[PDB]
Design a protein around this ligand. Sequence first.
Ligand SMILES: [Zn+2]
Ligand SMILES: [Zn+2]
Ligand SMILES: [Zn+2]
Ligand SMILES: [Zn+2]
Ligand SMILES: [Zn+2]
Ligand SMILES: [Zn+2]
Length: 71
Amino acid sequence: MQIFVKTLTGKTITLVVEPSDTIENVKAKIQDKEGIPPDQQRLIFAGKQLEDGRTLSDYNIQKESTLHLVL
Ligand SMILES: [Zn+2]
Ligand SMILES: [Zn+2]
Ligand SMILES: [Zn+2]
Ligand SMILES: [Zn+2]
Ligand SMILES: [Zn+2]
Ligand SMILES: [Zn+2]
């Protein structure tokens, strides 16, 4: 399972994840790829604001889904 995270510039980050991964897990992976602090990251999927403690599968994030980093 992989997902795509688009940064505020439109750069695509591809991440290996599992259904149970938390959004906090995802933020850590983004920090490692791009150096963006987790406290500065806000993620959306299908217009939903994603909370650190919930999982990909809680939000129906699927293989090949795209998330956005937002302000
Ligand atoms: Zn797979
Ligand atoms: Zn596992
Ligand atoms: Zn994981
Ligand atoms: Zn794991
Ligand atoms: Zn900070
Ligand atoms: Zn989009």
